[PDB]
Amino acid sequence: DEANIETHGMVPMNRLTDDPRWLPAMSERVTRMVQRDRNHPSVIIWSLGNESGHGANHDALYRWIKSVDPSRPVQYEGGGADTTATDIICPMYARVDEDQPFPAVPKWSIKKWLSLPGETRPLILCEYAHAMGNSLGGFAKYWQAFRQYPRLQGGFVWDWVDQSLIKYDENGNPWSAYGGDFGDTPNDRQFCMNGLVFADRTPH
Amino acid sequence: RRDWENPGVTQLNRLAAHPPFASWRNSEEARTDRPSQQLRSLNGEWRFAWFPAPEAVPESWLECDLPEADTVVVPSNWQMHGYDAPIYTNVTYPITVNPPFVPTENPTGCYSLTFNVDESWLQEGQTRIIFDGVNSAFHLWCNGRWVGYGQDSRLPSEFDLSAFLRAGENRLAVMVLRWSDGSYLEDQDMWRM
Amino acid sequence: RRDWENPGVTQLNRLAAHPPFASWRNSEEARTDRPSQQLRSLNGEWRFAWFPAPEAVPESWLECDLPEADTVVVPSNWQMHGYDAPIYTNVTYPITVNPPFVPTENPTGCYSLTFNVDESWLQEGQTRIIFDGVNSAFHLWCNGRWVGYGQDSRLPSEFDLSAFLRAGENRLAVMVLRWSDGSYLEDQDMWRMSGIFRDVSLLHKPTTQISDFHVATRFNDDFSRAVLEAEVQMCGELRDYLRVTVSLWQGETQVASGTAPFGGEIIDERGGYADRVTLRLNVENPKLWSAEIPNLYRAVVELHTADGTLIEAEACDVGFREVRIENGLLLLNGKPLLIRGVNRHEHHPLHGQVMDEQTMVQDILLMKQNNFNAVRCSHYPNHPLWYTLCDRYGLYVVDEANIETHGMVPMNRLTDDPRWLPAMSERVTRMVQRDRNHPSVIIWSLGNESGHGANHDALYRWIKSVDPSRPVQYEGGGADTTATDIICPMYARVDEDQPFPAVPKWSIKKWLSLPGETRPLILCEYAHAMGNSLGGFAKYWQAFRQYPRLQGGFVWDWVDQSLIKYDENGNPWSAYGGDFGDTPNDRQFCMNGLVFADRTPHPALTEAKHQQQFFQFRLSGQTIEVTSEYLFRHSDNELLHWMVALDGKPLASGEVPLDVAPQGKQLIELPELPQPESAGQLWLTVRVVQPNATAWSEAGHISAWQQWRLAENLSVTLPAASHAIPHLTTSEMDFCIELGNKRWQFNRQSGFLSQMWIGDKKQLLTPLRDQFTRAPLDNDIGVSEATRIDPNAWVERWKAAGHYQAEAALLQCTADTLADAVLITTAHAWQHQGKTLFISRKTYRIDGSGQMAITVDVEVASDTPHPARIGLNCQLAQVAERVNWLGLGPQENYPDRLTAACFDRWDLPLSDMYTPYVFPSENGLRCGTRELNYGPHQWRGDFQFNISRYSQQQLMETSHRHLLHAEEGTWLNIDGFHMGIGGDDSWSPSVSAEFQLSAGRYHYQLVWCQK
Ligand SMILES: O=C1O[C@H](CO)[C@H](O)[C@H](O)[C@H]1O
Ligand SMILES: O=C1O[C@H](CO)[C@H](O)[C@H](O)[C@H]1O
Ligand SMILES: [Mg+2]
Ligand SMILES: [Mg+2]
Ligand SMILES: [Mg+2]
Ligand SMILES: [Mg+2]
Ligand SMILES: [Mg+2]
Ligand SMILES: [Mg+2]
Ligand code: NA
Ligand code: NA
Ligand code: NA
Ligand code: NA
Ligand code: NA
Ligand code: NA
If asked whether residues C778 and C889 sit together in one domain, one would say: yes
How far, CA to CA in Å, does C921 sit from each of B103, C383, C636, C814, C1008? 71, 35, 43, 37, 27
Q: Which residue's CA lies nearest to atom 11 of ligand 2?
A: C189
DSSP string, C524-582: EEES---SS--TTHHHHHHHHHH-TTEEEEEES-SB---EEEE-TT--EEEE-TTTTS-
Task: Return d(Cα A64, Cα A32) in angstroms, integer.
Answer: 12
Burial of C101 (0-12, 13-18, 19+ CB in 10 A): middle
B97 near C CB under 8 A: no
Contact C381, C400 (CB under 8 A): yes
Nearest Cα to B86, choosing from B193, B178, B177?
B193
C-alpha to C-alpha distance for C707 and C650, rounded to whole angstroms: 14
For β-strands C937-948 and C926-934, DSSP reports them as antiparallel
Best of C530, C556, C557 to mutate for ligand 2, by most ligand atoms within 8 A of CB? C556
Question: First and final CA of chain A: distance in angstroms?
Answer: 26
DSSP conformation letters of C656-688: EE----TT-EEEEEPPP-----SSEEEEEEEEE
Chain A residue numbers with beta carbons less than 8 Å from the beta carbon of C11 are: none
Please state, in angstroms and rounded to a whole number, the distance separating the CA atoms of residues A197 and A174.
Answer: 18
B90 is in an annotated binding site: yes
Closest to B191 in 3D by CA, of B113, B88, B100, B106:
B88
Q: Do residues B190 and A163 make contact, with C-beta atoms less than 8 angstroms apart? A: yes
Q: Which residues 13-52 of B are in CB contact (within 8 Å) with C?
A: 16
A69: Cβ contacts below 8 Å, ≥ 6 apart: A34, A38, A46
For residue C1006, the cross-strand partners are C854, C941
Exposed, middle or buried by CB within 10 Å (0-12, 13-18, 19+), for C356?
middle
Residue B68 in contact with ligand 1 by CB distance below 6 A:
no
Do C701 and C732 belong together in one domain?
no
Say which amino acid occupies C464. K
CA triple C555-C559-C560, angle to 5 deg: 110
Looking at the fold, whether C853 and C788 belong to one and the same domain comes out as: yes
Residue A158, ligand 1, Cβ within 6 A: yes
Q: Where are the beta strands (DSSP E) in C723-863?
A: 727-730, 734-739, 742-747, 753-758, 761-762, 764-771, 807-817, 821-832, 835-847, 852-860
Measured from the Cβ of residue C59, the count of other Cβ atoms closer than 10 Å reads 7
Find the closest chain B residue to A32 by CA distance.
B17
Radius of gyration of chain A (CA): 19
Residue C819 forms beta bridges with which residues?
A: none
End-to-end CA distance of chain C: 81
Q: How far is CA C219 from the centre of its chain?
A: 34
Q: For residue A10, which residues of chain C lie inside 8 Å, CB to CB?
A: 270
| Contact yes or no for C462 and A78 at CB 8 A | no
Q: What are phi and psi of C985, to 5 degrees?
A: -155, 170
Packing angle, helices A23-37 and C421-435, rounded to 10: 150
Indicate if C525 belongs to the active site. Answer: yes
Is residue B146 within 8 Å of residue B13, measured between CB atoms?
A: no
Q: Give the CB-side neighbour count of residue C712, counting CA atoms within 13 A.
A: 6
Tell me, letter by letter, the H, E, C secondary structure of chain B.
Answer: CCHHHCCCCCEECCCCCCCCCCCCCCHHHHHHCCCCCCCCCCCEEEEEEEECCHHHCCHHHHCCCCCCCEEEEECCCHHHHCCCCCEEECCCCCCCCCCCCCCCCCCEEEEEEEECCCHHHHHCCCCEEEECCCCCEEEEEECCEEEEEEECCCCCEEEECCCCCCCCCEEEEEEEECCCHHHHHECCCEEEC
**B96 in Cβ contact with B103 (< 8 Å):** yes
**Is B132 annotated as ligand-binding?**
no
Beta bridge partners of C1001: C859
Give, as one character, the DSSP assignment of residue C391. Answer: I
CB C165 within 8 A of CB C117: yes
CATH code: domain of residue C100: 2.60.120.260
How far is the centre of ligand 12, averaged over its atoms, from the C-alpha of C494 (Å)?
A: 21
Other CB atoms within 10 Å distance of the CB of residue A164: 21
Could you tell me if B79 lies within 8 Å of chain A, comparing CB atoms? yes
Best of C189, C505, C528, C988 to mutate for ligand 2, by most ligand atoms within 8 A of CB? C189
Pick the closest to residue C612 from C395, C372, C342 (CA basis).
C372
| Antiparallel, parallel or unpaired: β A174-177 and B145-151 | unpaired
C839 plus C850 within the same structural domain:
yes
Strand order in the sheet with C665-669: C615-620, C623-628, C665-669
* B9 with C11: Cβ contact below 8 A: no
Q: Output the domain CATH number for residue C617.
A: 2.60.40.10
3-state secondary structure (DSSP) of residue C885: strand
Residue C995 CA neighbour count, 13 Å, CB half? 18
Q: Which residues pair with C685 in a beta bridge?
A: C643, C707
Q: Can you tell me the distance from the alpha carbon of C133 to that of C186, in angstroms, rounded to the nearest whole number?
A: 14
Contact C406/C189 with Cβ under 8 angstroms?
Answer: yes
> Could you tell me if C688 and C698 lie in one domain?
yes
Q: What is the CATH number of the domain that holds A130?
A: 3.20.20.80
Q: Nearest-CA neighbor of B95 among B152, B178, B176?
A: B178
Q: How was this structure determined?
A: X-ray
Q: Is C705:C692 a contact under the CB 8 Å cutoff?
A: no
C-beta separation of C877 from C753 below 8 A: no
Task: Give the integer Cα–Cα distance in Å for C150 and C140.
Answer: 9
Same domain for C671 and C538, yes or no, is no
Residue C695 amino acid letter: A
**Residue B9 CA to its chain's centroid (Å):** 16
Question: Which residues keep their CB under 5 angstroms from ion ligand 4?
Answer: A 8, 51; B 189
The rounded distance, in Å, linking the Cα atoms of A11 and A51 is 12
Element (H, E) at A36: helix A23-37
Q: Which of C539, C551, C563 lies closest to C77 in space, CA to CA?
A: C563
3-state secondary structure C891-916: CCCECCECCCCEEEEEEEEHHHHCCC
**Type of residue found at C328:** G
Three-class SS of residue A31?
helix
The three-state secondary structure class of C454 is helix
- Quick one: residue B191, left, alpha or beta (phi over 0 = left, psi -120 to 50 = alpha)? beta
Q: Identify the three-state secondary structure at position A111.
A: helix
Residues C962 and C798: their CA atoms lie apart, in Å, by 27
Alpha carbons C435 and C384: distance in angstroms, whole number: 8
What Cα–Cα distance (Å) separates residue C906 from each residue in C87, C559, C617, C643, C676? 43, 28, 24, 16, 22
User: What span, in angstroms and rounded, lies between the C-alpha atoms of C338 and C322?
Assistant: 16
Q: Is the dihedral of CA C598, C604, C607, C612 positive or negative?
A: negative
Q: Are residues C741 and C814 in the same domain?
A: yes
On the question of a cis peptide bond just before residue C3, with omega within 30 degrees of 0, the verdict is: no
- Give one word for C1001, left, alpha or beta, with left for phi > 0 and alpha for psi -120 to 50: beta
Peptide bond into C867 cis (omega under 30): no
Q: Which residues pair with C856 in a beta bridge?
A: C842, C1004
First to last CA, chain B: 24
Contact C464/A59, CB-based, under 8 Å?
A: yes
Spot the catalytic one: C314, C426, C449, C922: C449
CA distance C30 to C23: 8
Could you give the CA distance from residue C630 to residue C337 in angstroms, rounded to a whole number? 9
How many other C-beta atoms are found inside a 10 Å radius of the C-beta of residue C938? Answer: 16
Q: From the CA of C987, give the closest atom in ligand 2.
A: 5
Cβ distance C705 to C610 under 8 Å? Answer: yes
The domain total for chain C is 5
Cα A68 → chain centroid: 23
| C683 vs C650: CA distance, rounded Å | 10
Give the phi and the psi of residue C94 in degrees, each rounded to 5: -70, -5
- Do C597 and C98 touch, CB atoms closer than 8 A? no
Which residue range(s) make up the domain with B110? 1-193
3-state secondary structure of A197: strand
Query: Is the domain of C290 the same as that of C349?
Result: no
Q: How far apart are CA A108 and CA A5, in angstroms?
A: 25
Instruction: Answer yes or no: do C820 and C919 share one domain.
Output: yes
Which one-letter DSSP state was computed for residue C722?
P
Rounded Cα gap, residues A42 and A45, in angstroms: 9
Distance from C-alpha of C779 to C-alpha of C790, rounded to nearest angstrom: 12
| Beta pairing class for C329-332 and C335-336 | antiparallel
Q: After what residue numbers is chain C broken, C–N > 2.5 angstroms?
A: 786
Is residue C816 a contact partner of residue C823, using CB atoms and an 8 Å limit? yes
CB of C405 shorter than 6 A to ligand 2: no
State the Cα angle at C704 between C702 and C710, rounded to 5°.
Answer: 115
Cα separations (Å) of B122 from B119, B145, C297, C298, C397? 5, 17, 72, 70, 59
Instruction: Please report the sign of the dihedral spanned by the C-alpha atoms of residue A106, residue A111, residue A112, residue A118.
Output: positive
Whether residues C387 and C257 share a domain: the answer is no
Task: Say if the Cβ atoms of B19 and A39 lie within 8 Å.
Answer: yes
* Helix locations, C293-442, DSSP H: 357-369, 384-389, 421-435
Q: Which residues pair with C847 in a beta bridge?
A: C821
Give the Å distances, CA to CA, from C483 to A34, C378, C379, C519, C832.
21, 18, 17, 12, 53
Residue C261: closest CA among C272, C276, C280, C248: C276
Is residue C192 within 8 Å of residue C87, measured between CB atoms?
A: yes
- The ligand that comes nearest to the alpha carbon of residue C304 is 6
DSSP label at C966? P
The helix (run of H) or strand (run of E) holding residue A110 is helix A110-114
- CA–CA separation, C406 and C157 (whole Å): 25
Report the side by side order of strands in the sheet with C472-473: C472-473, C441-445, C396-400, C374-376, C339-343, C550-555, C521-526
Burial C502-527 (b: 16+ CB within 10 A, else e): ebebbebbebbeeeeeebbbbbbbbb
Name the residue among C660, C668, C705, C665 with its Cα closest to residue C687: C705
Q: Strands of C209-219's sheet, edge to edge? A: C209-219, C225-235, C276-284
